[PDB]
Design a protein around this ligand. Structure first.
Ligand SMILES: COc1cc(-c2cncc(-c3ccc(C4CCN(C)CC4)cc3)c2C)cc(OC)c1OC
Ligand SMILES: COc1cc(-c2cncc(-c3ccc(C4CCN(C)CC4)cc3)c2C)cc(OC)c1OC
Ligand SMILES: COc1cc(-c2cncc(-c3ccc(C4CCN(C)CC4)cc3)c2C)cc(OC)c1OC
Ligand SMILES: COc1cc(-c2cncc(-c3ccc(C4CCN(C)CC4)cc3)c2C)cc(OC)c1OC
Lengths: 283, 292
C-alpha cells in the first residue's frame, strides 16, 4: 500500500522561540504543523512520550494526528501534526471580538471541560495529566464556539511555564514538587487568569473592557520572575474586577469563581470538576 | 518527497512487522511496532535523535513516526534496507574464509565501540540486545548493528545515566549471567556495557563456527543450542549459564588455525562470570585489527 506522508506547508500562522506553526494540507484536509526549534526539542519529546502513553481524544483537547522525526544531513527535524482551527488562538480572538453571555460561558466551560479531562485519572483509561503552561495563547477557538487546549510540551503524568501565569507557589519556590495535586493547583491558578481575560470581553449594559493580559497594569512586557514574585507573592495582588461586572449576574458569578482559583493556599483552590459544575449552574 | 510504498513483508513476530518499501526510488526498511513494544519505539526514537550516532556499522535512520486517528496508533521506524538480511540469516547460507570472518567481526566490534564510547556530541550507549538477528549484512562485507529500543545512555561529562522506561528484557539466549540471576548493578553504566560484551562473545562464536579451516566447518547453531530446550525460558538459560556455569564449547579443530585460536581466546575473555574481568569493546576492536 501507498503511505502518503507529503504535507504541503501553505502559510506560517505562528513563529516564536518554540519554532513555527504552519497551516498545511494532507490529502485535501487542513492540518497544523508545529516545526520545533533545536532550543525546544524536549517539548516535542514530552508531547510524543505522553501520546505514546495515552492517545488523548477529547473535543476540548487539540486533536493529535502525528509526531514525525526526519533525519537531515546535519540535524534532526521534529514536527507535531494536529487538527487545524482556522479561528486561531483565544488570545488572538479576544483582541477583535466581544462576547455575549452564551458565547462567554461556552468558551470558559469548554476550557474547564478540557482541563478536567486532563486532570482526571480513568482506570482500565488515562493517567492524570497537568498542563503546566495554560494561557490564552495555548487555547484554540473552534467554529462551533467551544475551545480546545493545546501544547502538552510541559505536561506531567501521574522550559518552565509562562511567567505572567505562574502561581504564587511557583514564584516563591514553595511548590510541593513530589505531589501531583500541586501541578493541578498551578493549572487552576492559570485557568482563573484565562477566565478573567475572557470575562473582560463579555458585554453587559453596553460596556466591555479592552483585551488586556493578566497583570498588564503592574508588570512590564516579558515580566521577570522577580517582577511576578513581587506582585503575586509579596504584595499578593490579583487582577481587578471592574464595578460594571456587579450589575451582571453572569459576571458576578464569574468573579466569584476566578477568586476561588486565586487563593494563596493552593489546597483552597477549586478543582476543575467543581468549576465545571459551577459553570453549568450559571444562567 | 515523503511518500513510501510498502512492497513486501520481510519479517513478522512479537515486535510487529518489517517491510521492504520504496522511498524516492530507493529500497527502505519500514518497521511497524506491536503496541506491546511501544516503549521500544520511543527509546529508539530518542537514540536516533543523536546526529553523531551515524556510523558505517550502525543501521542508518531515515525517519520515525507516531500516527493516530481515533483510538488507533501506529508506530513507524524507517531505515536503510539491507537485502542480504541479518547475520543470523547469512550464516545459515554460507561459510566464511579468514578475511570475511575477520571483516564481519571487526565491523561489529567497530559499531559496538562507537556505541560504547562517548563523543564530547553522542552519549555513551549500551545496546542491551546484541544478537545475530540484530546485525545486518552489507554488500561491502561489513555489518551494522540494529535495534536500539533497549539502549541505555550515559554522559560522564554531566554525570547522567538514562536507563529509560522499558519493561522489555534482552533476548533470553544471549543474556549475561548477572542478567539471568538479576544481580546486575542497575545504576552502573559499565554494567550494561559488560552485558553487551558477553553477547558480543556469543556472536563471535556463532561467526567463527562458520569459518572454514583445514576443510572443516561447523553447522550454524545458536548459542547454547545443545544444552537448553527449544524456545528456552529465562529459567532454562539461568540453569545453564548461572547454575551449570556453561559456556559455548570451542571445537578442537579451531586450535589448528591461528585465526580461530586467537578468536577462541577473545570470546573466552568476553565470558568471565566477573563482569569487570571482561574485555572492553575498544580492546576487542584493537585485538581484531591486529589478528589475521
Ligand atoms: C509514517 O508516517 C505517516 C503516515 C501517515 C499515514 C498515511 N497513510 C496511511 C497510514 C496508515 C494508517 C494506519 C494503517 C493501519 C491499517 C490497519 N492495520 C491493521 C495496521 C496499520 C496503515 C496506514 C498512515 C499512518 C500519515 C502521515 O502524516 C499525516 C505520516 O507522517 C507523519
Ligand atoms: C498553541 O499550540 C499550538 C497551536 C496550533 C494551532 C492549531 N490550529 C490553528 C492555529 C492557528 C491558525 C490560524 C491563526 C491565525 C493566523 C492569521 N490569521 C489567519 C488569523 C488566524 C493562528 C493560529 C494554531 C497555531 C498547533 C500546534 O501544534 C501543531 C500547537 O502546538 C501544540
Ligand atoms: C494519522 O492520521 C490519519 C490517518 C488516516 C488513515 C489512513 N489509512 C488507514 C487508516 C486506518 C485503517 C484501519 C485501521 C484499523 C481499523 C480496525 N482494525 C482492523 C485495526 C486497524 C486503522 C487506521 C487511517 C486511520 C486517515 C486520516 O484522515 C482521514 C488521518 O488523519 C489525518
Ligand atoms: C533488526 O532490526 C531491524 C532490521 C531491519 C532490516 C533492515 N534491512 C533488512 C532487513 C531484512 C531483510 C530481508 C530479510 C530476509 C532474510 C532471509 N529470510 C528470512 C527472508 C527475510 C531479513 C532482514 C531488516 C529486518 C529494519 C529495522 O527497522 C526498520 C530493524 O529494527 C530496528
Amino acid at each position: 500500500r501507498t503511505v502518503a506522508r507529503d504535507i504541503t506547508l501553505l502559510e506560517c500562522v505562528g513563529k516564536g522561540r518554540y519554532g513555527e506553526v504552519w497551516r498545511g494540507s494532507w490529502q485535501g484536509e487542513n492540518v497544523a504543523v508545529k516545526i520545533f526549534s533545536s532550543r525546544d526539542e524536549k517539548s516535542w519529546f514530552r508531547e510524543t512520550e505522553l501520546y505514546n502513553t495515552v492517545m488523548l481524544r477529547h473535543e476540548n483537547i487539540l486533536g493529535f494526528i502525528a509526531s514525525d522525526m526526519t533525519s537531515r544531513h546535519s540535524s534532526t527535524q521534529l514536527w507535531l501534526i494536529t487538527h487545524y482551527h482556522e479561528m486561531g488562538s483565544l488570545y488572538d480572538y479576544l483582541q477583535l471580538t466581544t462576547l455575549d453571555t452564551v458565547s462567554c460561558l461556552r468558551i470558559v466551560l469548554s476550557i474547564a471541560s478540557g482541563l478536567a479531562h486532563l486532570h482526571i485519572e480513568i482506570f482500565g483509561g488515562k493517567p492524570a495529566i497537568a498542563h503546566r503552561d495554560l494561557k490564552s495563547k495555548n487555547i484554540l477557538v473552534k467554529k462551533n464556539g467551544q475551545c480546545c487546549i493545546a501544547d502538552l510540551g510541559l505536561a506531567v503524568m501521574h522550559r518552565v511555564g509562562t511567567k505572567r501565569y505562574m502561581a504564587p507557589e511557583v514564584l516563591d519556590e514553595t511548590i510541593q514538587v513530589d505531589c501531583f495535586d500541586s501541578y493541578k493547583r498551578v493549572d487552576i491558578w492559570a485557568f482563573g487568569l484565562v477566565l478573567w481575560e475572557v470575562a473582560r470581553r463579555m458585554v453587559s449594559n453596553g460596556i466591555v473592557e479592552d483585551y488586556k493580559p493578566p497583570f498588564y497594569d503592574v508588570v512590564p512586557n516579558d515580566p521577570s520572575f522577580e517582577d511576578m514574585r513581587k506582585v503575586v507573592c509579596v504584595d499578593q495582588q490579583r487582577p481587578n474586577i471592574p464595578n460594571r461586572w456587579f450589575s451582571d449576574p453572569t459576571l458576578t458569578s464569574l468573579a466569584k469563581l476566578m477568586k476561588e482559583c486565586w487563593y494563596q493556599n493552593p489546597s483552597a483552590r477549586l478543582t476543575a470538576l467543581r468549576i465545571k459544575k459551577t459553570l453549568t449552574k450559571i444562567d
